[PDB]
Amino acid sequence: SMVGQLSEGAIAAIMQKGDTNIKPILQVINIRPITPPRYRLLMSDGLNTLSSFMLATQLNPLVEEEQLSSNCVCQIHRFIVNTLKDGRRVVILMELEVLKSAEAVGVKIGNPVPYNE
């Protein structure tokens, strides 16, 4: 199945269990610039979506040159979770690989629901 390609449950593992050494495969649902530009990502593991992913600045060329885009599938290789002053937690993506382009995937996979943030 297409959702079988994703690391179902990885978002819960990051948020609830504090798993930091997993290398989950996730789908980009949306990329939003925020304000040197920074990018917030809505990401999916096939079961849940999380709105609080942020791209490390060193990864901005992946967005700028349009290889990281809505519907692409990527594997996260390094990330850090940080807590903001108001209690919101942000997952900062430091290293990732784009495994399949948006054009090669072509759709949002499955029907993930928002994780409780």
Binding site: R32, I34, R38, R40, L84, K85, D86, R88, V90
Partner: peptide, 13 residues
């Protein structure tokens, strides 16, 4: 979803 004005200041670092 989007970050509040306060969050935006902290994320810059």
């Amino acid at each position: 979803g989007d970050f509040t004005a306060d969050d935006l200041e902290e994320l810059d670092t």
